[PDB]
């Protein structure tokens, strides 16, 4: 029953690739994906992928005996600045499991006991922010987000305070960051990447990456001339040894994993959060509900780790939110052998696949006829939910290694937001989802009515 999988419009020698000319292009693949279906034939010159959108198909992807970790032509381009780090690595690269075995106890749930009062530092600053607002100001919630994951990620990882809280403006990284990330994005639909009219990206984006590695450079100096004891996600780069090969990490892929985890850790959460806040304001039922738990559990001024662990709602919430938009779209496979997917489409090693998760997420086979709902319910009985329906953190021993981090991060966040405010959506808000590869809400204002308990 082998089947021919339909494909978009094509752009004679160009192919597919004028379809990713877009500011939305995750946006636009999910409409392709509503009128073709499942799957989808994706062609650039050069180059072959497979769009798949169901979970049907989505769970053999996930097979790691059949298929492995691909290098998207989005992440080969963050490559030039994140290296050989965890997140732009291939499997069988030295510098993956070395740095994964490394790296995987600094998320223990040790050393996210550890990371707990410097995440309450972080939020803290943001409940203040807010409870400091004049009458009828607003929140600007992707941007203050943003301040809140980076300091996060800054303070617990490295010991940095990146004061994004104490800044109008965007923290110079971040500006360089959003930049680097807009032209991988952008790039991806250049037929010719090295017509000269492209010269002044190059220059633009080498600039943006000399930003962010001086950066790295002070939180390495500052490190290693520190005469305070560490025990964080810096300290297990600098010291931690792999029991495998026996070696640490050397200097060049420290440098690319401290790039990676600054990103990584803190971009994805930041919308989160920010799809978080929009879905229960437009749902203010379940606003309400999560806003019950919040004050039940968070009896005390400062959160503790253990009453995190206990907002369970908030946490339904979140997975909700992922759900619907996953802040890190699509992740991408290869075929390690000759095989069959679903009975229909044959591949050949080497095949590429990209798995559109917005799209899986919103398979009514799985989730039902309201899938568009707001429903944090949905995840009540994990036991209930089939297997590889929902995607939001990757696949296999290529998923994400930060995952309790984010959680704990957005559901303390969270949490203490829905303890101290109650939030109104004035400008009843359009949900205008903004890409830079990853997928954060734009535009997005709420104002906040402090509830007057203090901190
Ligand atoms: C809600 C927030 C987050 C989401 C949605 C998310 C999603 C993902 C996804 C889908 C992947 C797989 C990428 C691929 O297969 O190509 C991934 C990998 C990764 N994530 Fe996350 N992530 C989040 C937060 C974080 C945080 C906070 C950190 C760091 C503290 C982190 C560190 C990583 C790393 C290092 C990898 C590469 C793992 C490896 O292959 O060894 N992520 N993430
Ligand atoms: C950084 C974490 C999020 C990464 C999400 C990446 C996911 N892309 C983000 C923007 C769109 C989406 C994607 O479909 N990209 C493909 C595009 C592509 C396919 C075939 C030929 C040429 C180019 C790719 O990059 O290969
Ligand atoms: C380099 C990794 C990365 C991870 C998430 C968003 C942008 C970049």
């Given at each position: 029953?082998?089947?021919?999988?339909?494909?978009?419009?094509?752009?004679?020698?160009?192919?597919?690739?004028?379809?990713?000319?877009?500011?939305?292009?995750?946006?636009?693949?999910?409409?392709?994906?509503?009128?073709?279906?499942?799957?989808?034939?994706?062609?650039?010159?050069?180059?072959?992928?497979?769009?798949?959108?169901?979970?049907r198909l989505?769970?053999?992807?996930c097979?790691?005996?059949?298929?492995?970790?691909?290098?998207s032509?989005?992440?080969?381009?963050?490559?030039?600045?994140?290296?050989?780090?965890?997140?732009?690595?291939?499997?069988?690269?030295?510098?993956?499991?070395?740095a994964?075995?490394?790296?995987?106890?600094?998320?223990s749930?040790?050393?996210?006991?550890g990371?707990?009062?410097?995440?309450?530092?972080?939020?803290?600053?943001?409940?203040?922010?807010?409870?400091?607002?004049?009458?009828?100001?607003?929140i600007?919630?992707?941007?203050?987000?943003?301040?809140?994951?980076?300091?996060?990620?800054?303070?617990?990882?490295?010991?940095?305070?990146?004061?994004?809280?104490?800044?109008?403006?965007?923290?110079?990284?971040?500006?360089?960051?959003?930049?680097?990330?807009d032209?991988?994005?952008?790039?991806?639909?250049?037929?010719?990447?090295?017509?000269?009219?492209?010269?002044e990206?190059?220059?633009?984006?080498?600039?943006?990456?000399?930003?962010?590695?001086?950066?790295?450079?002070?939180?390495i100096?500052?490190?290693?001339?520190?005469?305070?004891?560490?025990?964080?996600?810096?300290?297990?780069?600098?010291?931690?040894?792999?029991?495998?090969?026996?070696?640490?990490?050397?200097?060049?892929?420290?440098?690319?994993?401290?790039?990676?985890?600054?990103?990584?850790?803190?971009?994805?959460?930041?919308g989160?959060?920010?799809?978080?806040?929009?879905?229960?304001?437009?749902?203010?039922?379940?606003?309400?509900?999560?806003?019950?738990?919040?004050?039940?559990?968070?009896?005390?001024?400062?959160?503790?780790?253990?009453?995190?662990?206990?907002?369970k709602?908030?946490?339904?919430?979140?997975?909700?939110?992922?759900?619907?938009?996953?802040?890190?779209?699509?992740?991408?496979?290869?075929?390690?052998?000759?095989?069959?997917?679903?009975?229909?489409?044959?591949?050949?090693?080497?095949?590429?696949?990209?798995?559109?998760?917005?799209?899986?997420?919103?398979?009514?086979?799985?989730?039902?006829?309201?899938?568009?709902?707001?429903?944090?319910?949905?995840?009540?009985?994990?036991?209930?939910?089939?297997?590889?329906?929902?995607?939001?953190?990757?696949?296999?021993?290529?998923?994400?290694?930060?995952?309790?981090?984010?959680?704990?991060?957005?559901?303390?966040?969270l949490?203490?937001?829905?303890?101290?405010?109650?939030?109104?959506?004035?400008?009843?808000?359009?949900?205008?989802?903004?890409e830079?590869?990853?997928?954060?809400?734009?535009?997005?204002?709420?104002?906040?009515?402090?509830?007057?308990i203090?901190?």
């Amino acid at each position: 029953t082998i089947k021919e999988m339909p494909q978009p419009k094509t752009f004679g020698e160009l192919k597919n690739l004028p379809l990713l000319n877009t500011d939305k292009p995750v946006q636009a693949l999910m409409k392709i994906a509503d009128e073709l279906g499942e799957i989808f034939k994706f062609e650039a010159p050069g180059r072959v992928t497979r769009y798949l959108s169901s979970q049907r198909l989505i769970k053999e992807a996930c097979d790691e005996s059949r298929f492995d970790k691909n290098l998207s032509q989005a992440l080969k381009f963050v490559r030039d600045f994140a290296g050989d780090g965890l997140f732009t690595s291939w499997t069988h690269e030295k510098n993956w499991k070395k740095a994964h075995n490394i790296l995987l106890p600094s998320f223990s749930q040790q050393a996210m006991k550890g990371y707990h009062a410097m995440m309450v530092d972080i939020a803290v600053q943001l409940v203040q922010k807010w409870e400091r607002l004049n009458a009828d100001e607003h929140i600007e919630v992707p941007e203050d987000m943003t301040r809140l994951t980076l300091d996060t990620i800054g303070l617990c990882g490295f010991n940095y305070r990146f004061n994004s809280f104490y800044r109008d403006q965007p923290h110079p990284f971040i500006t360089s960051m959003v930049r680097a990330l807009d032209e991988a994005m952008n790039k991806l639909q250049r037929a010719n990447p090295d017509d000269p009219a492209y010269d002044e990206n190059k220059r633009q984006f080498q600039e943006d990456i000399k930003v962010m590695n001086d950066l790295v450079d002070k939180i390495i100096a500052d490190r290693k001339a520190s005469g305070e004891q560490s025990d964080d996600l810096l300290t297990h780069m600098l010291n931690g040894k792999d029991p495998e090969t026996g070696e640490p990490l050397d200097d060049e892929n420290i440098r690319y994993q401290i790039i990676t985890f600054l990103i990584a850790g803190h971009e994805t959460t930041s919308g989160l959060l920010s799809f978080a806040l929009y879905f229960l304001v437009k749902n203010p039922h379940v606003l309400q509900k999560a806003a019950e738990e919040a004050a039940r559990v968070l009896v005390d001024p400062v959160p503790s780790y253990k009453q995190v662990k206990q907002l369970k709602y908030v946490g339904m919430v979140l997975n909700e939110a992922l759900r619907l938009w996953p802040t890190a779209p699509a992740f991408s496979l290869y075929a390690k052998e000759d095989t069959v997917l679903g009975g229909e489409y044959p591949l050949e090693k080497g095949d590429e696949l990209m798995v559109l998760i917005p799209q899986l997420h919103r398979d009514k086979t799985i989730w039902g006829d309201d899938v568009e709902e707001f429903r944090p319910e949905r995840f009540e009985n994990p036991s209930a939910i089939p297997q590889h329906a929902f995607k939001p953190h990757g696949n296999g021993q290529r998923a994400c290694i930060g995952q309790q981090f984010a959680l704990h991060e957005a559901t303390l966040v969270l949490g203490m937001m829905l303890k101290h405010f109650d939030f109104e959506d004035h400008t009843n808000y359009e949900l205008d989802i903004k890409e830079t590869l990853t997928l954060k809400p734009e535009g997005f204002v709420v104002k906040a009515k402090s509830k007057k308990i203090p901190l």
